[PDB]
Design a protein around this ligand. Structure first.
Ligand SMILES: Nc1ncnc2c1ncn2[C@@H]1O[C@H](COP(=O)(O)OP(=O)(O)O)[C@@H](O)[C@H]1O
Ligand SMILES: Nc1ncnc2c1ncn2[C@@H]1O[C@H](COP(=O)(O)OP(=O)(O)O)[C@@H](O)[C@H]1O
Ligand SMILES: [Mg+2]
Ligand SMILES: [Mg+2]
Lengths: 362, 335
């Protein structure tokens, strides 16, 4: 019947016209809501940045690790916590002035990995909002550096926790229209010489100005993996640590967050630089450059603090590598790891001595 | 053939199922968006608290009231909002931008004339829950007559304000300390001032605890009514409202609440209490009392270790311009 079809058409055009209409109102609401969400996050980002500014763009921490179940009769020095920020160490040698230092926070032998991450988590957000972060673990060998950054399968550290935070955040960000991409890169620094950790073929790399920014950095010939998913990253990390076989080398692991918002044509890029510094201990029993680097690094932070105008980042491979992350907007976390034992008293006092020169900068 | 019109019935069935799927697609994106937008608003407001708590012990909010349903003939000046906390006013006449032509001030928050009573109280909220943690909160209303002070502190039975709204939460909080055990006693109080002569909003010529939510809500409205002031018979009265609290774990958590509705800030009597409050306040901020009955009276639920809060009410009218600028100036001065 032609009349049936004719009637089904007229109805069809009716449902189509009603749907096109109701369909254009959603498009309209979706639009404003989109705009107000972008605008809202934007302010949220700024409100977050203010809080980071108020707690400090450069904060120093202290972490005396618990003693190992295998060597304990080496009477740990005498530790006293004058408050959750100030700590003092005395030696058990029967008779300097005193040895007391202030931090932004002090973690004792019972502070869990989870507890230290809580000092870092806020920064994973800043990196996602386009800021650069640097996280160091400074101290003598055996004091706690590696266990703090990487950790142990039994109890994980800063880096593994950051990746879980990253992917969880990144995943959520999608609901805002941001598509994030992570650039992974791992490297080492023995004698002012850079070594890639995702390859074996020796190749000479070097720090050079970046394409679209003479202020940014670029390491030529290094492996820069574009993370596919957390499996891909887990593979990369395990693979990295693999070839890392030391306490006289600087291990840097950089994750660069490239956020791309398509419909708003806005781009965001921040970076996390997790550094497992080399032993700060003094030579006893040739290690020229290792004392250079560490001092250069601690001088650049001290400069950054007193707002020194022209800073010589190039005076060292490391300080040159992290230069764009030691800049203005940047935030820097510094974990001073320490050993409780007697034999480390003088060494431990050396480490801690950075806490005084940091705030004496006022 | 004409049965060839089955071509269009088919072609249409698709457009139909097309716009149908596309209908259902936008409804999902729009649900996620409102969802996310709501998460993004919460975070923003909490970080905003952390910021205000991190810097000072005194918040300043600015509130611009919309034109009353009866003032379609009053001219307004040009208002400009640059942020959520930066507002500027420009006079209507040219010769006005001839002298320091830039009136722009910054506060912890600026409320548009279309801001709901709930939007306001939402900034105050964080301070009520703070009283049960031991502090002395202090809420103020400042501005000329016809600005929004009373409407903000109290409100209208159709639209409740801060003083009422607190109450609600004040309890919903105790319903939370009464879990493993803790008991509270709401010591309410109601007074006022006229010309340095304190009266009372309860009896006629006076602290009674509260043992019933609506009970507190009663002596509250009683006071509201006992507050018999039709316009300038209230242009010089300071409507204070003490509300001390105490709690012992079921070791006596003492807090407070000091809601105030100051007198018109514009030119007139004495009104020194204000020029006095200002000094007392700027001096506290400077961080280093009986010049007015007011200051002296609430000279403890202030000072150090107490979170205070001030509202600056303004009218969007051109004839108010100097008075407004006078009010923003003051606030800014705190700023
Ligand atoms: N906080 C800690 N808790 C438990 N073990 C720790 C802790 N810190 C360090 N260790 C132990 O120290 C040894 C090597 O750790 P680490 O301190 O990172 O060396 P380095 O200080 O040279 O980086 C390991 O046996 C590790 O388990
Ligand atoms: N934010 C507002 N929204 C709607 N009306 C308001 C607002 N603020 C004040 N008003 C109106 O202004 C009039 C007087 O209010 P109010 O500001 O309390 O005066 P005063 O500042 O002298 O105490 C009332 O009619 C009130 O409804
Ligand atoms: Mg190590
Ligand atoms: Mg009034």
């Amino acid at each position: 019947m032609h009349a049936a079809l004719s009637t089904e058409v007229v109805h069809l055009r009716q449902r189509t016209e009603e749907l096109l209409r109701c369909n254009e109102q959603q498009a309209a609401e979706l639009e404003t809501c989109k705009e107000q969400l972008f605008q809202s996050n934007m302010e949220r980002k700024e409100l977050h940045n203010t809080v980071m500014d108020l707690r400090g763009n450069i904060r120093v921490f202290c972490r005396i690790r618990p003693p190992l179940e295998s060597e304990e009769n080496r009477m740990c020095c005498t530790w006293t916590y004058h408050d959750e920020s100030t700590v003092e160490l005395q030696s058990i040698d029967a008779q300097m002035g005193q040895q007391i230092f202030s931090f932004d926070q002090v973690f004792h032998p019972l502070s869990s990995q989870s507890d230290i991450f809580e000092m870092v988590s806020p920064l994973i957000q800043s990196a996602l909002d386009g800021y650069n972060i640097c996280i160091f673990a400074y101290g003598q060998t055996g004091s706690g550096k590696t266990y703090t950054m990487d950790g142990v399968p039994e109890s994980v550290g800063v880096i593994p926790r950051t990746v879980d935070l990253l992917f969880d955040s990144i995943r959520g960000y999608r609901n805002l229209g941001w598509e994030y991409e992570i650039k992974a890169t791992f490297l080492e620094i023995y004698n002012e010489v850079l070594y890639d950790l995702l390859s074996n073929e020796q190749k000479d790399m070097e720090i050079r100005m970046a394409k679209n920014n003479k202020n940014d950095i670029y390491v030529s010939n290094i492996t820069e993996e574009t993370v596919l998913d957390p499996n891909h990253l887990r593979h990369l990390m395990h693979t990295a640590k693999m070839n890392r076989a030391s306490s006289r080398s600087h291990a840097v692991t950089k994750l660069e967050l490239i956020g791309r918002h398509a419909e708003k044509q806005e781009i965001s890029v921040g970076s996390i630089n997790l550094v497992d510094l080399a032993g700060s201990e003094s030579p006893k029993t040739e290690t020229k450059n290792i004392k250079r680097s560490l001092s250069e690094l601690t001088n650049v932070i001290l400069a950054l603090l007193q707002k020194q105008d022209h800073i010589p980042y190039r005076n060292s491979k490391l300080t040159h590598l992290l230069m764009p992350s030691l800049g203005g907007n940047s935030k820097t976390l510094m974990f001073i790891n320490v050993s409780p034992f007697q034999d480390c008293f003088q060494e431990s006092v050396k480490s801690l001595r950075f806490a005084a020169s940091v705030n004496s900068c006022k």
